[PDB]
Design a protein around this motif. Structure first.
Motif, PDB file in Angstrom:
ATOM      1  N   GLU A 276     -29.843 -22.079 -18.452  1.00  0.00           N
ATOM      2  CA  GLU A 276     -30.447 -22.460 -19.724  1.00  0.00           C
ATOM      3  C   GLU A 276     -29.586 -23.470 -20.486  1.00  0.00           C
ATOM      4  O   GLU A 276     -30.125 -24.329 -21.187  1.00  0.00           O
ATOM      5  CB  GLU A 276     -30.714 -21.198 -20.556  1.00  0.00           C
TER       6      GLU A 276
ATOM      7  N   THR B 193     -34.428  -5.986 -16.711  1.00  0.00           N
ATOM      8  CA  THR B 193     -32.987  -6.008 -16.914  1.00  0.00           C
ATOM      9  C   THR B 193     -32.505  -7.433 -16.694  1.00  0.00           C
ATOM     10  O   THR B 193     -33.142  -8.203 -15.977  1.00  0.00           O
ATOM     11  CB  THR B 193     -32.273  -5.051 -15.934  1.00  0.00           C
ATOM     12  N   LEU B 194     -31.364  -7.782 -17.292  1.00  0.00           N
ATOM     13  CA  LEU B 194     -30.757  -9.093 -17.064  1.00  0.00           C
ATOM     14  C   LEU B 194     -29.459  -8.981 -16.280  1.00  0.00           C
ATOM     15  O   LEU B 194     -28.765  -9.983 -16.095  1.00  0.00           O
ATOM     16  CB  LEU B 194     -30.516  -9.833 -18.388  1.00  0.00           C
ATOM     17  N   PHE B 195     -29.109  -7.757 -15.792  1.00  0.00           N
ATOM     18  CA  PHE B 195     -27.954  -7.521 -14.943  1.00  0.00           C
ATOM     19  C   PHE B 195     -28.401  -7.332 -13.502  1.00  0.00           C
ATOM     20  O   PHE B 195     -29.471  -6.775 -13.252  1.00  0.00           O
ATOM     21  CB  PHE B 195     -27.191  -6.263 -15.377  1.00  0.00           C
TER      22      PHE B 195
ATOM     23  N   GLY C 277     -32.316  -3.863 -22.172  1.00  0.00           N
ATOM     24  CA  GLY C 277     -33.451  -4.444 -21.459  1.00  0.00           C
ATOM     25  C   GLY C 277     -33.335  -5.946 -21.237  1.00  0.00           C
ATOM     26  O   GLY C 277     -32.352  -6.441 -20.678  1.00  0.00           O
ATOM     27  N   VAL C 278     -34.369  -6.679 -21.663  1.00  0.00           N
ATOM     28  CA  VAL C 278     -34.426  -8.120 -21.424  1.00  0.00           C
ATOM     29  C   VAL C 278     -34.025  -8.908 -22.671  1.00  0.00           C
ATOM     30  O   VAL C 278     -34.471 -10.045 -22.871  1.00  0.00           O
ATOM     31  CB  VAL C 278     -35.828  -8.548 -20.928  1.00  0.00           C
TER      32      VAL C 278
ATOM     33  N   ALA D 132     -30.846 -16.953 -16.821  1.00  0.00           N
ATOM     34  CA  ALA D 132     -30.677 -15.683 -17.524  1.00  0.00           C
ATOM     35  C   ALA D 132     -31.755 -14.671 -17.150  1.00  0.00           C
ATOM     36  O   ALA D 132     -31.485 -13.465 -17.046  1.00  0.00           O
ATOM     37  CB  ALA D 132     -30.692 -15.929 -19.037  1.00  0.00           C
ATOM     38  N   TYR D 133     -32.988 -15.134 -16.964  1.00  0.00           N
ATOM     39  CA  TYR D 133     -34.107 -14.225 -16.794  1.00  0.00           C
ATOM     40  C   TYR D 133     -34.492 -14.001 -15.335  1.00  0.00           C
ATOM     41  O   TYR D 133     -35.204 -13.038 -15.033  1.00  0.00           O
ATOM     42  CB  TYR D 133     -35.330 -14.751 -17.566  1.00  0.00           C
TER      43      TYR D 133
ATOM     44  N   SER E 145     -33.136 -18.861 -28.527  1.00  0.00           N
ATOM     45  CA  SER E 145     -32.285 -18.772 -27.341  1.00  0.00           C
ATOM     46  C   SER E 145     -32.034 -20.154 -26.748  1.00  0.00           C
ATOM     47  O   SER E 145     -30.885 -20.548 -26.513  1.00  0.00           O
ATOM     48  CB  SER E 145     -32.908 -17.864 -26.273  1.00  0.00           C
TER      49      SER E 145
ATOM     50  N   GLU F 279     -29.833 -12.205 -25.974  1.00  0.00           N
ATOM     51  CA  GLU F 279     -28.704 -12.314 -26.897  1.00  0.00           C
ATOM     52  C   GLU F 279     -27.752 -11.130 -26.753  1.00  0.00           C
ATOM     53  O   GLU F 279     -26.527 -11.307 -26.777  1.00  0.00           O
ATOM     54  CB  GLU F 279     -29.195 -12.430 -28.342  1.00  0.00           C
TER      55      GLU F 279
ATOM     56  N   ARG G 164     -30.718 -22.974 -29.836  1.00  0.00           N
ATOM     57  CA  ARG G 164     -29.320 -23.103 -30.231  1.00  0.00           C
ATOM     58  C   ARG G 164     -28.551 -23.945 -29.227  1.00  0.00           C
ATOM     59  O   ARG G 164     -27.607 -24.650 -29.605  1.00  0.00           O
ATOM     60  CB  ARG G 164     -28.666 -21.717 -30.381  1.00  0.00           C
ATOM     61  N   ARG G 165     -28.953 -23.894 -27.954  1.00  0.00           N
ATOM     62  CA  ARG G 165     -28.301 -24.698 -26.933  1.00  0.00           C
ATOM     63  C   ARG G 165     -28.716 -26.158 -27.051  1.00  0.00           C
ATOM     64  O   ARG G 165     -27.905 -27.052 -26.798  1.00  0.00           O
ATOM     65  CB  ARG G 165     -28.641 -24.139 -25.544  1.00  0.00           C
TER      66      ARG G 165
ATOM     67  N   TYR H  84     -22.947 -19.080 -11.856  1.00  0.00           N
ATOM     68  CA  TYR H  84     -23.621 -18.293 -12.889  1.00  0.00           C
ATOM     69  C   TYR H  84     -23.397 -16.797 -12.685  1.00  0.00           C
ATOM     70  O   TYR H  84     -23.174 -16.048 -13.648  1.00  0.00           O
ATOM     71  CB  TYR H  84     -25.117 -18.611 -12.888  1.00  0.00           C
TER      72      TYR H  84
ATOM     73  N   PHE I 252     -42.594 -10.666 -24.882  1.00  0.00           N
ATOM     74  CA  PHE I 252     -41.759  -9.574 -25.393  1.00  0.00           C
ATOM     75  C   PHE I 252     -40.805  -9.998 -26.511  1.00  0.00           C
ATOM     76  O   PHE I 252     -40.092  -9.133 -27.050  1.00  0.00           O
ATOM     77  CB  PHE I 252     -40.969  -8.885 -24.255  1.00  0.00           C
ATOM     78  N   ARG I 253     -40.802 -11.277 -26.909  1.00  0.00           N
ATOM     79  CA  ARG I 253     -39.988 -11.766 -28.029  1.00  0.00           C
ATOM     80  C   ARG I 253     -40.816 -12.074 -29.281  1.00  0.00           C
ATOM     81  O   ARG I 253     -40.830 -11.277 -30.222  1.00  0.00           O
ATOM     82  CB  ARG I 253     -39.196 -13.012 -27.595  1.00  0.00           C
TER      83      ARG I 253
ATOM     84  N   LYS J 283     -16.770  -9.539 -21.872  1.00  0.00           N
ATOM     85  CA  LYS J 283     -16.153  -9.358 -20.563  1.00  0.00           C
ATOM     86  C   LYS J 283     -15.265 -10.544 -20.209  1.00  0.00           C
ATOM     87  O   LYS J 283     -14.168 -10.366 -19.659  1.00  0.00           O
ATOM     88  CB  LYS J 283     -17.243  -9.158 -19.512  1.00  0.00           C
TER      89      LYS J 283
ATOM     90  N   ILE K 198     -19.562 -13.891 -13.384  1.00  0.00           N
ATOM     91  CA  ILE K 198     -19.151 -12.994 -14.466  1.00  0.00           C
ATOM     92  C   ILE K 198     -19.769 -11.603 -14.321  1.00  0.00           C
ATOM     93  O   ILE K 198     -19.262 -10.638 -14.911  1.00  0.00           O
ATOM     94  CB  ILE K 198     -19.507 -13.635 -15.822  1.00  0.00           C
ATOM     95  N   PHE K 199     -20.855 -11.466 -13.550  1.00  0.00           N
ATOM     96  CA  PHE K 199     -21.479 -10.164 -13.369  1.00  0.00           C
ATOM     97  C   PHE K 199     -20.752  -9.276 -12.363  1.00  0.00           C
ATOM     98  O   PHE K 199     -20.994  -8.065 -12.362  1.00  0.00           O
ATOM     99  CB  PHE K 199     -22.951 -10.322 -12.925  1.00  0.00           C
TER     100      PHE K 199
END
Ligand SMILES: NC(=O)C1=CN([C@@H]2O[C@H](COP(=O)(O)OP(=O)(O)OC[C@H]3O[C@@H](n4cnc5c(N)ncnc54)[C@H](OP(=O)(O)O)[C@@H]3O)[C@@H](O)[C@H]2O)C=CC1
Ligand SMILES: NC(=O)C1=CN([C@@H]2O[C@H](COP(=O)(O)OP(=O)(O)OC[C@H]3O[C@@H](n4cnc5c(N)ncnc54)[C@H](OP(=O)(O)O)[C@@H]3O)[C@@H](O)[C@H]2O)C=CC1
Ligand SMILES: COc1cc([C@H]2OC[C@H]3[C@@H]2CO[C@@H]3c2ccc(O)c(OC)c2)ccc1O
Ligand SMILES: COc1cc([C@H]2OC[C@H]3[C@@H]2CO[C@@H]3c2ccc(O)c(OC)c2)ccc1O
Lengths: 312, 312
Positions: free
Chosen positions: B197, B174-176, A40-41, B163-164, B15, A44, B18-19, B307, B89-90, A53, B310-311
């Motif tokens: 991010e 989804t993040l894809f 999902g979302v 990312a989002y 998320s 990480e 750390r950056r 960005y 959702f986190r 990849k 890579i997808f």
């Protein structure tokens, strides 16, 4: 020239799983990782997969809720490694692997399956009490399904991850070592087996196409990491040039009030009891032909004095 | 020679957090990270902190439940950056920062506090509906406490994390990015601001001791990343040499049945509505003297074609 090994890692964003992906890439296996829609979302998880990849891994879409997607994923590879969750305070979804076993059986092309073992050998733990016994009963249910399906296997067992037992001097509830005082289980003179979780992943990548370990249990017992808790504490005392104040905890006091504790703590108490009071990781002998560091002596495993250095 | 900047990052395993730690180290700040006892047996959190220590960060023990431990932590530094959670959702623990504000006020030595902003400017979002409005109301409560305490601040706002919203062509859940079909919000011709991010963290490290941004809101609007959703989709279509089948979703249909959805989805729908239907990130002009890429033009920000690569 020579046989190619394609590996699907199921659970590739897990704590051990991500290290198995890295180790398979480093070993030269053609490395595939399951990309589940259910992540999902979770940024990480998604970005771990993308990091694999970038390093040459192949992302394979599939869901445990879609039997045919699992069949299609495992048809692409020669070996499947599952690092499915199995820790009460994280998640404990060992039985979901039954769906993976069924997909492997139908696909027919998988030369070996390594289920999510990587700890105490569940076949030795019939005496365990609930709720900790769920770990061993569920892992045995997977082993029984593997046998019924005729799937070739390797079970990698027999060591404590340094993250959970070594770097914290085996103190519960924290992963950092204490500064002044330490609780010692019993007299602290019961041998425990410690392994860097990174090295557990290296031995996974080494063993999964080793003919010597076809349909075998492989024990991870790095000689220099067979340590009593007092020995572990003394490594830390040497690194810090400081003696810790020791409290010796009887078995009776360790288990006191267990029925009133949270489920995940009850599980932890049970596991710690088997390891530190019963000595379950060192109360049986194993042969060199079934021990990881003798099978794969080129892995220069991390010793616990090195593991602990970053904590001082 | 010159003034030294010590920075405490609170939320360093998050998320964005750390950056921010990484970016502060790279900028040359003396970088401290709060090590909370409540992270407990979370191996990913603990090992992130250790990874920062290996790179030269200083781990500082403290708990939000222990006021004096927070005071002692912030007394060690010049600037505090909070990356406290704020996504339904986190977790959504923005108000816990009130305890940090109180500790900063008592300590008295902190030259600047950056609270957990890093998204839509909450001061512009008074019209938002619950539950999404909780994000903006809670962040305003922190701003009001900052003002009452007289703490100097910078608020970094105004962009969607790639990312989002970017790597997934803004598809929810989804993040894809999708393979064949894409939902377009409205007519897809409303400008949105996208930022990697990683670059949000770079601008944090640049701005936190910039005299030009003392007590200012700083908008993150990278010119090449001010894109409509159709423009974003066209970048992907070019990378993949494939046209996606587009469905145009009316505002009425986007919000349909919202009261029956899970809370975190209701929040997401509300945020997406402001961004893609109301154009809230681009419906106001900002000056060069308050926009991150003009203030810090040496940051070569990542464009969305890079960005997305890579997808594919
Ligand atoms: N000291 C020791 O020896 C220790 C041994 N272990 C053992 O290691 C193994 C792995 O544990 P750990 O690394 O902590 O596992 P994690 O908790 O990190 O979970 C591993 C993976 O399980 C997958 N998973 C969880 N739930 C589901 C579900 N409902 N459906 C599908 N997939 C799911 C996920 O895969 P995905 O990546 O696809 O999301 C996740 O990343 C276990 O068997 C455990 O008992 C673990 C701790 C210490
Ligand atoms: N597109 C955009 O612009 C987006 C903007 N944002 C904004 O970014 C900011 C950070 O979000 P994100 O990175 O997702 O945050 P995370 O969910 O990763 O959480 C960040 C940190 O919050 C700390 N935290 C959470 N709960 C508590 C608590 N009860 N007590 C103490 N500390 C706690 C933790 O710190 P520790 O490391 O110490 O454990 C955690 O690592 C938020 O304001 C959010 O609204 C986020 C998503 C997208
Ligand atoms: C060593 O073998 C195993 C270990 C584990 C451990 O992973 C982490 C858990 C569990 C046993 O005890 C660990 C633990 C539980 C509770 C705690 O508070 C704790 O603190 C470090 C550590 C699971 C399965 C195994 O076969
Ligand atoms: C852009 O500004 C913000 C964005 C966010 C976003 O972080 C992730 C959430 C939230 C808004 O919508 C995101 C989201 C919610 C639900 C989804 O299903 C989703 O899928 C990509 C994405 C939070 C606060 C902000 O100020």
């Amino acid at each position: 020239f020579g046989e190619k090994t394609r590996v699907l890692v199921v659970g590739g964003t897990g704590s051990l799983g991500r290290r198995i992906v890295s180790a398979c890439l480093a070993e030269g296996h053609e490395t595939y990782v399951l990309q589940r829609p259910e992540i999902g979302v979770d940024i990480e998880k998604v970005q771990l997969l993308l990091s694999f990849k970038r390093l040459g891994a192949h992302l394979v879409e599939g869901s445990f809720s879609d039997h045919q997607s699992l069949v299609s994923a495992v048809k692409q590879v020669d070996v499947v490694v599952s690092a499915m969750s199995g820790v009460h305070f994280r998640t404990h979804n060992i039985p979901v692997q039954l769906k993976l076993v069924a997909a492997i059986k139908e696909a027919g092309n998988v030369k070996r399956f390594l289920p999510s073992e990587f700890g105490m050998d569940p076949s030795r733990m019939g005496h365990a009490m609930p709720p900790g016994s769920e770990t061993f009963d569920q892992k045995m249910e997977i082993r029984n399904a593997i046998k019924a399906a005729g799937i070739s296997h390797t079970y990698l067992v027999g060591a404590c991850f340094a993250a959970y037992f070594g770097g914290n001097l085996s103190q519960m509830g924290t992963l950092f070592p204490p500064k002044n005082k330490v609780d010692i289980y019993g007299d602290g003179n019961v041998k425990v087996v410690f392994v860097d979780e990174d090295d557990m992943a290296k031995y996974t990548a080494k063993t999964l196409n080793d003919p010597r370990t076809l349909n075998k249990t492989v024990y991870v017992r790095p000689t220099d990491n067979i340590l009593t808790q007092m020995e572990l504490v003394q490594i830390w005392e040497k690194l810090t040039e400081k003696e810790l104040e020791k409290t010796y905890v009887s078995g009776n006091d360790f288990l006191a009030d267990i029925e009133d504790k949270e489920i995940s703590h009850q599980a932890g108490l049970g596991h710690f009891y088997h390891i530190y009071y019963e000595g379950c990781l060192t109360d049986h002998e194993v042969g060199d032909d079934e021990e990881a560091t003798k099978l794969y002596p080129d892995v220069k495993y991390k010793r616990m004095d090195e593991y602990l250095k970053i904590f001082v």
